[model samples]
Target chain A: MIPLTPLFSRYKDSYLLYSFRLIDLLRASKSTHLTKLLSSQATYLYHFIQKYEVQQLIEWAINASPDMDLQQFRIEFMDKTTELNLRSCQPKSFTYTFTTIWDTMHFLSLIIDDMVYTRDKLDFVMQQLKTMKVLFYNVFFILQAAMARDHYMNVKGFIIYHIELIEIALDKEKYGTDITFVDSYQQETAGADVSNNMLMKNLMAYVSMTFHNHINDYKWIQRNKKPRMTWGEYKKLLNL
Target chain B: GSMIPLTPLFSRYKDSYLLYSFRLIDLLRASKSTHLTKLLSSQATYLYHFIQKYEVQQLIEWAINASPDMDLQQFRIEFMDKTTELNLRSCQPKSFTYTFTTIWDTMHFLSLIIDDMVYTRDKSLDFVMQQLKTMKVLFYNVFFILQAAMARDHYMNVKGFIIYHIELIEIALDKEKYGTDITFVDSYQQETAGADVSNNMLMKNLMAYVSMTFHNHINDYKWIQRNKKPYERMTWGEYKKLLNL
Candidate 1:
């Protein structure tokens, strides 16, 4: 038991460090080796989580939520850290999974950036944006209903977080000097605009906000001493 | 190509013809056959109206049998000029539009084939056989004309583009028929086309075009065994320069 603590700490710390380093590397590098690098990171994650003691810590974190279990807390810290890392590194797909609004926002930014850089491929960008818009609305509707139910105290927080993210993403002040969100949206509606760069820029800005929001949320969750949203409550909030 | 699934003949015929028309326009674009492109574009619009507003099969039969009419030629010219004028005004890159159309048409073709086959088996069978025979002749005539145009040095650079698109479509169709995943990228590229220099040129250009056009999706998929990111999206200028077009 004593021997495992340092090993756990080593894997946990190194895993997170590697995750961020990989993302930064991916973001900066234009090498065709990106896919290869992502593949390797995925393998590393798989192996790291599959370690015997780490597996136990994960189970502990998942099952022992809301209690003052430091091991559980450590496991969760590792879990979310790696989760975002993996997601960020992944290639975009026609279908996306969003367990949290933060994930949705982050992905939205990625897509927006993609749309800007590859204007010629507007067919894909438009379809992806359309899907994301529907998803955004769907999430809003669900969260709206959940807040109305008053099933938890954090509903308001969740809603505010997402709304702020969306506002930031689509805000004209951030990216609308040349082409406002409304302007781009209107052009898209008129079928007069296919490149849709202005809209893409706006969306990308919003996603950047979500990234900041994610970091702050992580810190807030750790700083709070009192029992806040329980695991059950989190699941209920997401209606998962 | 295998026999067209005969479960729903007329409906399938309608769908396939539309798909073929779309493909034909793309091919014509690749060939730089501006006259044929506009002609087919107008005819497609007309066919859409005729199918929706009149008898589809009967209209097709009439067009097939009737002597080339002045009205049709006049319509073709008018439609062609309108498209050219609008395109000029829009200042949209011709290659960009062609690439966009190619993907749109390919995706449509991919999504098709699942509609309920709705005609009698014998009727469907006969119609499909006749259409397939006609399509072969159509291909021959189109290729023949393209060759003649090539003698005048038209569409020389674009032949590779045309062949690449056709290969992609063929790959997609064959994969669908075999119940295989559509994630293939011609595993053994060199052996597939042999050592022919022209074929190699076509394959190389096709790859570059595909990578440039679909930086985020298919291009990434081919490399990583999945479409993961950090895509190096190439600009239109870069693509044109690379292809020497």
Candidate 2:
């Protein structure tokens, strides 16, 4: 198979993770249970998806969850993957749309699978996570591009799929809005919304999809998904 | 591929064949274009819907078509200026249909492009010029359509979207008892309905989502990059200078 090097090389400025190696740290600490579980999932998925990367997983999963109200699940998934504290991915203050985020999340997942399942390189894992974060922000940027010029409707389905994923991810924000007090100015009070582990996992999932290269996947989403309703949806959810 | 420049004219303009399309639309709206006026007026609203609703696609295609190599730092500054003056907050205050839709559609497309540019890391040419140009063309098409219709549901979605946002804010502020416990509204009304959470934290999130909501935006684009840059990258001083903020 062609290497992921080409994709990674083209998007270097977007990646932003330091030398925080989860694999090495976990193995060194002898956190056997966590390490084993993560490694096993990565291994199974990597081998299963040798030919197919993360995009297929998104299309398949989203297509499978058609009637299950996957919106919340998708959102939570994205929020988890793209959170600042978690994966340590993405640039500072970057925002993105669901379509590109979905792709980027998938790409990042593949990177993690490559490191955890095959090469097992700590550095590779870190870089993968960072790049995926960058990818998340890029997705948002791309959506804005479509919206600004009034072209978002062209790829409506792709955007919808990821929006659902992000909704799901936010719903399951694990850290519970954990508060952190920083001295950026006077007494600034803010909370880190997610953890690094979750962030890394989310980024991996996002990146794997974006770099999938299948225009069919892109077209399928544009053709099928419905735009999200803001207030009416709320009323509907509550039977109002 | 040969360097073919973008040619993003409104559909109405294309109907004019090789001639300038905006002029045709204006002529059609003049009530002297005979049968052409009827079609122009009817098709105009739908066309506006396409333009107002799909801001993201316009930007992406615009980026793909235009100079993709320009760094957007400076482009972003000017774009932000255009956005702040044209944001939803501004849209809500306008009462005129023509003023509102034209502004709404223009901002709708502009915000989406700026948002996308930041995410794609393609700051080249800064703001989305091609999409912005389309916005101008689309505005003319919709404007003539509005002129011909003598007032149709041309801006219904714009109104619906704005109301949707306001209602969301209302819901968020009243989340503790919104759509439930009729007594909650009564109690608040009895004491001071003004104390309602219309502008509370939940309202902020609601508005933030509304503010963030690009027309026809899909959540999938979130996965594209780590940095989703908003075009409205302004300082407090710049904002004050622009809007007396």
Candidate 3:
């Protein structure tokens, strides 16, 4: 057993730091290096007995008082440490996984923490795994809903909704104190404002513009060939 | 070739900026086109309205259409005047009545893609790229024009001022070119043009405005506190500089 005592001490009880060390040990590579971990001092968190399996963690997160998209939440939950590294560095395998996971988990947490709906938190006595499952279920629901409605048609609103949610979540909770991050040590790191999701949103603006031209091609297929649909109606069809 | 260095417009007084802002606002109000729409909802609106303008919009369209006897000078003047006026007022409630923080970044990213298709001729992206390119070019050209006027006017504080535009240029480059990047500075300086103090500053301003002010990322501008040194925000000036003289 890698003596857990010193391991905990060296990281100053920072789960982000310990997780980063684990990530490094995982051969995460230099490119995948997250700068925030290196730049900021570690925060000491009062160790708690609230431990749960990764699956259970997701379940609790998702099916908790307020339901959340577990899959998305899982992505963001894991991302808090992951994304800080990628926003500055180039893309590599380690960098890719770290950022992708970091982005997903960070956003998921924000939503579950009610960054999106501005709703009341729930008091349902649910397990972590169940909560994660519930959140993932929403991801599945949105995706399935998107696919069923005209994937391409509703895709715009899905993307926009994604951006809108992030924008709100990012604004209030970014690098700030939130009740949702009550026990989260990473949340104390607080530089959450500059996360992978934020960078992706930034990058998306550029990528979407490039992809925008292809949208006209979609129009030709649906408009020139099939019955023409206004973008508004297309949006309606997609439930946007 | 006559551009100045670390140039300051009014040496005797610190109050010229106030009148400059007023001049700009008046010019925008007097514009003959809705091209100066009081409010823009999205990045698309910023580009579309600029394209709707007679001066800058016309020049970009003419360039693309390959039209004859292009009045590049007159076009440049109108564009610069309008853009500077608009940029100074961009954040003011009078301009974008509905301020969404993300709008500036969204515009910058879209503008860069548009600039690529319009200026660089990357046709593989299709007509959509071309159209956006034209719109972005028109948008940027207007920004560049504003820089020229600023160079001629707000002389003292155009250094840290120019940094904002350098940040924007880096956006169009699709690379992380900070204002302090030496290589970008060298190349950018070499390609500098115009009749001001430093063409390099102008180019930097041009690129920065393209990527920053027109987009959403940096547009919210709430951080620009009233007492902050560089961003000393005010509506008018104390010095009695020529107002619409």
Candidate 4:
């Protein structure tokens, strides 16, 4: 859409509409809608792959290498790649986890301290957390494939071990378990602040509880309300 | 008329007792000044949290309460700008994370402080002692989280990453529930740490043990930025070269 430059002309066929994500042409080949739609034009869509040099394009997706030995690759790695891709793309919406899981880890590393004041910003963080939960969870499916033969105790631990870890991490991540971090990045912001916001309320309680000013301060029933900014919470309030 | 007779009534009006009463009066006077410093400290600390609480409280309320702007289009306009500008991608040859909880109790306490310098304020004596204690813990937490991230980096796989995470938490949970006799294991029961040390020794002893796993599995932290930051669009490549790997 942005000028359709030289590279765009070459790679445009590789992308999906409205997203920069590459089309899984191998997966597309399995789509009933694609073949059905193309079959109406006399020559079948099944034939389209050979006619358009689809295997080479698939190789291009691998890398822009002219050195691909298509014969060996078709029988060897492509089948395995298809199996892995099929696992990641399963049950729909799972692909979001596949795409964002690594990016979310990097995003958390970079922006763990970034100020998030807006509802949309909070939503963005929550979206990352939801994907993290799903990403951490789907490990079962992958290991489940190994369950038939790999009766080894470690393969068994692989499933139960993560399930418990996810529970513990998500729970502590829920309570924020500790009052971690001061926002140095919070220096950039707008609006009159420091009151009623979830973190400030919690920090205020921390100040009162840790010190002895409590004769005046602790007289009130200080509530430890769940903070939206805490790790792993879904804070999306659409009206807000 | 203003003059009133005062009685110095110590037992038998003894000089030894009368002298004692004068010392007690001064003792009461000295007590006020010392504890008063403590009173004010507690007072000032609350005020800091008080101001921060109210300041953000108002800001949050208004953002939630402000006039409705149903313009989702305007919302996405900024989102699109950042995404187009910053979101870059590369293929990972497709990947994988966890465990030992004895170390985790301490680890949990961390992920929590790092404003050591300008923020340190007045508490300097124990603060230095705290720094040695804290900074080391911070290093371990950094190592652990990075290690978790790199498990995915290892295989670019999540089931294994979650397995890695689960293995860690289970070890952490093991230490939490069972306390330190159990040896640490990776996801596959490979001995992660060689220690069967006492509970007190396990935490500081962590890096001593896990650095082996870290040594075997580790990649340089800077190398990861190539995928995340891509070209790392910034002031200079030499800057990264200057202080970091």
Q: Provide the TM-score for each candidate, comma-separated.
A: 0.20, 0.22, 0.21, 0.19
Q: In model 3, which runs have C-alpha deviations exceeding 4 angstroms?
A: A1-26, A31-240, B1-221, B224-245
- Summarize candidate 3's per-residue lDDT along B51-89 as a digit string, tens digits: 224443433332233322335444334445545654522
The DockQ figures for the candidates are 0.01, 0.02, 0.01, 0.02
Which sections of candidate 2 miss by over 4 Å?
Answer: A1-240, B1-105, B108-245
- Model 1: per-residue lDDT, tens digit, A116-180? 44444133443444344333322221233443222112122222222222322332223343333
**Chain A TM-scores, one per candidate?**
0.26, 0.22, 0.19, 0.20
Worst 10 residues of 3 chain A by lDDT: A40-49
Candidate 3: C-alpha lDDT: 0.28
Provide backbone clash counts, one per model: 6, 117, 52, 34
lDDT of 2 by residue, B1-245 (tens): 11111233212122232112222223332344446555554333233332334443332223233333433443334333433444412212122233333433343333333223322322232133333333333433333333434233222212223332232222222332322311222111121222221222322122222323422222222322232321222222332233221
**lDDT by residue (tens digit), candidate 4, B1-245:** 11111222211122222122211121222234646333333322221221345433332232233333534334334323432343311100011102322223222222111212212323243343334333332332222222355444332221232223222322332333333443333222132222211331122222222322222122222233232211222122232233121
Candidate 3 chain B lowest-lDDT run of ten: B236-245
RMSD of 1: 24.0
| Inter-residue clash pairs, candidate 1 | A91-B228, A169-A206, B7-B117, B8-B117, B8-B118, B8-B119
Task: Give the local distance difference test score of model 1.
Answer: 0.33
- Candidate 4 chain B minimal-lDDT segment of 10 residues: B88-97
